Amino acid sequence: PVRRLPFSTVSKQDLAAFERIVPGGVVTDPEALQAPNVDWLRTLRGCSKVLLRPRTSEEVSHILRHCHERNLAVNPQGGNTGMVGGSVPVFDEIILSTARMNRVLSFHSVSGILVCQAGCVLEELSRYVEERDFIMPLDLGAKGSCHIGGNVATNAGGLRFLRYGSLHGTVLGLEVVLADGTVLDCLTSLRKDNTGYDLKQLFIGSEGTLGIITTVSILCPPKPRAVNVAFLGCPGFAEVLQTFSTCKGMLGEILSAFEFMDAVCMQLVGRHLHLASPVQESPFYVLIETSGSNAGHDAEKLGHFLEHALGSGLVTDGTMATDQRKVKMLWALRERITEALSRDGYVYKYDLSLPVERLYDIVTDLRARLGPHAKHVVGYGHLGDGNLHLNVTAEAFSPSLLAALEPHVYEWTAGQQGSVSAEHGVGFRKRDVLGYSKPPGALQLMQQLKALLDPKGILNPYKTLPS
Amino acid sequence: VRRLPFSTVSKQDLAAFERIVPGGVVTDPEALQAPNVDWLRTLRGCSKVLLRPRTSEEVSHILRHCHERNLAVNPQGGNTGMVGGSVPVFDEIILSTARMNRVLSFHSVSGILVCQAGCVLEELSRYVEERDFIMPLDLGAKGSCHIGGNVATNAGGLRFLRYGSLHGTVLGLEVVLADGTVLDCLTSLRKDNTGYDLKQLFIGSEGTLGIITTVSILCPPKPRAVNVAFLGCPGFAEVLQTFSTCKGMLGEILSAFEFMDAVCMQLVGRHLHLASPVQESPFYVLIETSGSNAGHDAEKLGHFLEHALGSGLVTDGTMATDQRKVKMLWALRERITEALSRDGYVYKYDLSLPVERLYDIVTDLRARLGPHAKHVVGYGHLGDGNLHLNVTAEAFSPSLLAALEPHVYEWTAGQQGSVSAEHGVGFRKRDVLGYSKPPGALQLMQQLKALLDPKGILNPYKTLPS
Ligand SMILES: Cc1cc2nc3c(=O)[nH]c(=O)nc-3n(C[C@H](O)[C@H](O)[C@H](O)COP(=O)(O)OP(=O)(O)OC[C@H]3O[C@@H](n4cnc5c(N)ncnc54)[C@H](O)[C@@H]3O)c2cc1C
Ligand SMILES: Cc1cc2nc3c(=O)[nH]c(=O)nc-3n(C[C@H](O)[C@H](O)[C@H](O)COP(=O)(O)OP(=O)(O)OC[C@H]3O[C@@H](n4cnc5c(N)ncnc54)[C@H](O)[C@@H]3O)c2cc1C
Ligand SMILES: O=C(O)CCC(=O)C(=O)O
Ligand SMILES: O=C(O)CCC(=O)C(=O)O
Ligand SMILES: [Zn+2]
Ligand SMILES: [Zn+2]
């Protein structure tokens, strides 16, 4: 296994220092530390003995200043919805939670620029801006728990990426506390600014190994006047791909989401969350969302799209909704697959970028390679972006299944020149599989960046660079 | 201001470069004149060596030699940069991407383009448009600028409102570092969270951290319908309401919103002989839309125009969908920078400001500088909060400089604005970044420069403070 690096340990004097620095924000009770020590999948557990909950950036600066002088390792944590073990300690790293850094600083109702603390919950930010007729540029099934700071640190993708793009584009600025407690102010709430190096980009997707994000400035799209959702059954993956092509050709700029899921996903969502399918049983399903300025025009585009899709046999059955309640009901069938999977058993999880034409091949392969040893194998996700969520469920973890899955899935993916972690990131789980997607010189430059910014390595050790 | 202690090019260095890039060592003094002068013709280097590599390996071997020999290197693209970043100050070797102009691949379904850094933007637009795709950026310099230069400066431009930043649209980069090390970040995937997004360091790094040799970029689909409305507005308040209504009524099809003042129109007419298509107005707005259903777009433009004329926001307007008339209208905006440089000496500021007060500095400068300036103009990417502010005089005046600076930079800082929205920093603005960046940021920038290029051979005297 992995060996604990020679960091110091938390003393009573350290506890008293933290009580001085964040009054009422020091949690030491072992039973209270249980939950923050366990990851979302419940397959990794740390042994942290202290949780710190600052309210302000200055408090984070002072905490890290102390940890730097004392050589104490720190595990930043947001919503703890991460999928790659990055969010919980390996040994006894201090858990630094942003839960109480949850204030909105400002919102400009013309530019649509939001500035808020890192621990603001995504769904809550959505409620805040939507009250003002804007939306967040990203959305994901974790919205109820994930923090904007976590989203920036992981460079989260999600359900509207196809329309609004990367956080590398929509984040306008960051305030970041470095490992020695230096406050880096890159919080330029401006749409455009070419005044030197774009330092904030370094912290988007860096997963807390280069600094702790404390404040975010983000560009919020305007709220669409008209939202439509279509939910369609396709008789094969080829028809899914042609449905995508036709969808881009006929809906065009109003397209805001394209998601697929297979028959097994639908069966599991029905079985564990009791959500009935609104279309005839099909081997594949597709959820399409549109967002636009003119209801009538979007309706015409969608109507012609559906007529043509059903006409050429790409879709066997379909349903449409504009009512907010029904739209949300349709979205639940896609959003809650991940929950249903973790209720089905032990989950082997893979998050892959592949050539869209070959996105589902691995699922067929694994269904054949694995026998009755897999309880289920599923594929679903952000097909428009080339992103497959591959999952295998079983009654319990097994070394034999792991040996069948790995390195086979990663070698297949490298064979397709794909990404072994499209959006979820690296963290603890994937730190040793980056060679399938990144050349050695890049990994070395990443290590040099880490050495520059955190020479003591107190921020999220054992992640998210190779050993 | 003062030359750093770099080596000098010897005869043996020339023979080495001839070995590395045979045919690509230009030493003719008359041939070196043009690459030593920046686009504005206000900076002039004294470089005696231009190298024109063809491949990434040639670049790698050149920089390896320059690192061992401590020779300064000035990367150069199309030489359309505006901040003196693209030409030597003293005797840096000019490394041109002019011959690195091949397309390597283009996926006709995903729209992913892989090309060498020296491909000219216009030529790439032609290439991908023949295949029903477009570049995610466009600028008035399209005819000369290289994709490598666009990435190195993080160019914004005329369709930024729709497709956004190169920070979002660039998918991969091959970069050659100061010691010759080839950094491969040339992925062609839309989504890849396998470590740090290293390529981001080089977008906007202006050749001080590495030389971009290959670009992978996501091309948007080519629109079925492009419309342009060129409108005359009777004041800036009405410009702002035209913008607000435009967003409410056009929405997702909007691909451009540019503005210009009256003096700009007069200067393009006077110096470029381009006639106005609408009545004389104090302000002009160019709106472009791009969509997949030409009839829906046309209906949206109709309702928008009818309401804008009806509510008095616009006085006179012309619309165009024919490609020729679209290009005619676009020329009135695209060529303002050229018309300005033909009016005399140009004091050029490129600011990000709150949109609601984007033009206030123009009126302030017109009152502050009475008859001592020839013209003060404001135009540019209003949708993105970016004002191009220019003052022309028949000749440069130290008086007029003292009136403009630091005043303009102080006003911008008072608005928490950017003193270089688009064009970057280069040589001209290296010592005015404090108006937009705090000292800790600039310090970290210097630490990254020191990590990636400890000898400082890549683009000295730029683009960090002295
Ligand atoms: C049901 C479900 C659906 C999901 N859907 C998606 C999806 O569509 N797309 C997608 O990309 N991901 C998705 N995810 C995973 C995604 O990574 C998380 O939902 C989210 O991005 C992490 O936010 P968090 O606040 O929970 O971060 P955490 O799990 O708390 O932490 C994530 C990582 O960032 C670090 N970190 C946390 N806060 C900070 C900070 N302030 N500064 C610096 N580093 C910090 C942590 O150390 C850790 O390494 C999903 C997860 C679930 C459970
Ligand atoms: C008429 C006109 C209109 C313009 N409009 C706009 C506009 O709308 N928006 C906008 O943002 N800019 C605009 N610009 C300026 C813009 O910054 C440049 O035109 C553009 O970025 C391309 O630069 P280039 O190819 O000429 O590079 P160069 O000028 O040759 O170089 C620019 C800088 O980048 C460096 N560099 C160049 N190539 C490389 C490389 N391969 N690797 C590393 N470093 C490199 C150089 O050292 C220098 O510092 C305009 C310019 C003109 C003349
Ligand atoms: O279930 C998974 O593999 C991850 C969840 C996710 O990213 C999604 O639901 O889109
Ligand atoms: O004229 C200027 O200030 C620069 C050119 C430019 O970026 C523009 O024409 O949009
Ligand atoms: Zn996902
Ligand atoms: Zn411009």
B438–chain A Cβ distance below 8 A for any pair: yes
Asked if B200 lies within 8 A of A110 by C-beta distance, the reply is no
B203: left (phi over 0), alpha (psi -120 to 50) or beta: beta
User: Which 3 state secondary structure label does DSSP give B400?
Assistant: helix
Q: Which of residues 264-303 of B touch A (CB under 8 A)?
A: 290-293, 296, 299-300
Nearest residue to A270 (alpha-carbon basis) of A319, A367, A337, A191: A337
- Binding site membership of B150 for ligand 2 (Cβ less than 6 Å): yes
Which pair of structure tokens corresponds to residue B135?
């570049």
- Bridge partner list, A362: none
Which pair of structure tokens corresponds to residue A420?
């072994």
CA B303 to chain centre: 34
Cis amide linkage into residue B29, ω under 30° from 0: no
B132–chain A Cβ distance below 8 A for any pair: no
Nearest residue to A86 (alpha-carbon basis) of A68, A102, A69, A74: A74
The Cα B79–Cα A38 span in angstroms is: 55
Nearest residue to B81 (alpha-carbon basis) of B146, B5, B162: B146
Tell me whether strands B386-393 and B316-320 are parallel, antiparallel or unpaired.
unpaired
Q: Which residues contact A262 (CB under 8 A, 6 or more apart)?
A: A283, A284, A285, A360, A363, A378, A379, A380
C-beta separation of B288 from B256 below 8 A:
yes
The Cα B229–Cα B320 span in angstroms is: 7
The Cα B463–Cα B433 span in angstroms is: 10
Which pair of structure tokens corresponds to residue A125?
């930010």
Write the DSSP symbol of residue B277.
S
Q: Which of A110, A191, A293 sits opposite B252 (nearest CB)?
A: A293
A425–chain B Cβ distance below 8 A for any pair: yes
- Binding site membership of B422 for ligand 2 (Cβ less than 6 Å): yes
Nearest residue to B116 (alpha-carbon basis) of B73, B203, B55: B55
- To 10 degrees, the CA torsion angle through B199, B200, B204, B205? -60
Helix residue spans in B22-88 (DSSP H):
33-36, 56-69
Nearest residue to B271 (alpha-carbon basis) of B419, B403, B392: B392
The Cα B228–Cα B233 span in angstroms is: 16
Q: Residue A102: how many CA atoms within 13 Å on its side-chain side?
A: 17
The Cα B241–Cα B283 span in angstroms is: 13
Given in angstroms, what resolution was this structure solved at?
Answer: 2.8
Question: What separation in angstroms does the CA of B464 have from each of A194, B200, B229, B329?
Answer: 12, 17, 41, 38
* Ligand 3 center–CA A386 separation, angstroms: 14
C-beta separation of B150 from B97 below 8 A:
no
Separation in Å, CA of B6 to nearest CA in chain A: 24
C-beta separation of B174 from B56 below 8 A:
yes
Q: Which residues have CB under 6 Å of ligand 4?
A: B 82, 140, 336-337, 340, 348, 350, 380, 388, 390, 422
The Cα A68–Cα A86 span in angstroms is: 20
What chain B holds in terms of domains, given with CATH numbers, is: 11-99+452-452 (3.30.43.10), 103-218 (3.30.465.10), 225-338 (3.30.70.2190), 339-434 (3.30.70.2740)
Q: Which atom of ligand 1 is nearest to the CA of A82?
A: 29
Order of strands, sheet of B25-26, starting from the edge strand that comes earlier in the sequence: B25-26, B50-51, B93-96, B73-76
C-beta separation of B93 from B63 below 8 A:
no
Helix residue spans in B44-192 (DSSP H):
56-69, 121-130, 147-153, 160-163, 166-169
Nearest CA to ligand 4 atom 2: B337
* Ligand 2 center–CA B145 separation, angstroms: 6
CA B140 to chain centre: 9
Q: Residue B42: how many CA atoms within 13 Å on its side-chain side?
A: 17
Question: Which experiment gave this structure?
Answer: X-ray
- Bridge partner list, A313: none
Which pair of structure tokens corresponds to residue A155?
């460079």
Tell me whether strands B73-76 and B93-96 are parallel, antiparallel or unpaired.
parallel
C-beta separation of B121 from B145 below 8 A:
yes
Q: Which residues contact A300 (CB under 8 A, 6 or more apart)?
A: B293, B296
The Cα B66–Cα B17 span in angstroms is: 10
Q: Residue A82: how many CA atoms within 13 Å on its side-chain side?
A: 35
Q: Which residues contact A280 (CB under 8 A, 6 or more apart)?
A: A233, A316, A317
Which pair of structure tokens corresponds to residue B84?
């003196």
> With 0-12 CB in 10 A as exposed, 13-18 as middle and 19+ as buried, what is B324?
exposed
Q: Which residues contact B19 (CB under 8 A, 6 or more apart)?
A: none
φ and ψ at residue A409, rounded to 5 degrees: -65, -40
What's the sign of the alpha-carbon dihedral A238, A240, A243, A247? negative
The Cα A73–Cα A82 span in angstroms is: 20
Nearest CA to ligand 4 atom 4: B337
C-beta separation of B390 from B376 below 8 A:
yes
* Ligand 6 center–CA B386 separation, angstroms: 8
3-state secondary structure chain A: CCCCCCCCCCCHHHHHHHHHHCCCCEECCCCCCHHHHECCCCCCECCCCCEECCCCHHHHHHHHHHHHHHCCCEEEECCCCCCCCCCCCCCCCEEEECCCCCCEEEECCCCCEEEEECCCEHHHHHHHHHHCCECCCCCCCCCCCCEHHHHHHHCCCCCCHHHHCCHHHHEEEEEEECCCCCEEEECCCCCCCCCCCCCHHHHCCCCCCCCEEEEEEEECCECCCEEEEEEEEECCHHHHHHHHHHHHHHHHHHEEEEEEEEHHHHHHHHHHHCCCCCCCCCCEEEEEEEEECCHHHHHHHHHHHHHHHHHCCCCCEEEEECCHHHHHHHHHHHHCHHHHHHHHCEEEEEEEECCHHHCCHHHHHHHHHCCCCCCEEEEEECHHHCEEEEEEEECCCCHHHHHHHCCHHHHHHHHCCCECECCCCCCCCCCCCHHHCCCHHHHHHHHHHHHHHCCCCCECCCCCCCC
The Cα B322–Cα B329 span in angstroms is: 11
CA A273 to chain centre: 22
Q: Which of residues 189-218 of A touch B (CB under 8 A)?
A: 189-199, 201-202, 204-206, 210
Nearest residue to B109 (alpha-carbon basis) of B219, B234, B238, B247: B219
State which residue of chain A sits closest to B244, comparing Cα positions: A110
- Bridge partner list, B93: B73
- To 10 degrees, the CA torsion angle through B218, B220, B222, B228? -130
How big is chain B by its Cα radius of gyration, in Å? Answer: 23
A259: left (phi over 0), alpha (psi -120 to 50) or beta: beta
B380: left (phi over 0), alpha (psi -120 to 50) or beta: left
Q: Which of A196, A254, A386 sits opposite B425 (nearest CB)?
A: A196
Write the DSSP symbol of residue B37.
B
Give residue numbers after which chain B breaks (C–N above 2.5 Å). Answer: none
The Cα B12–Cα A85 span in angstroms is: 56
- Which amino acid appears at position A306 of this protein? L
* Ligand 4 center–CA B349 separation, angstroms: 10
Q: What angle is formed at CA B306 by the lines to CA B305 and CA B308, rounded to 5 degrees?
A: 60
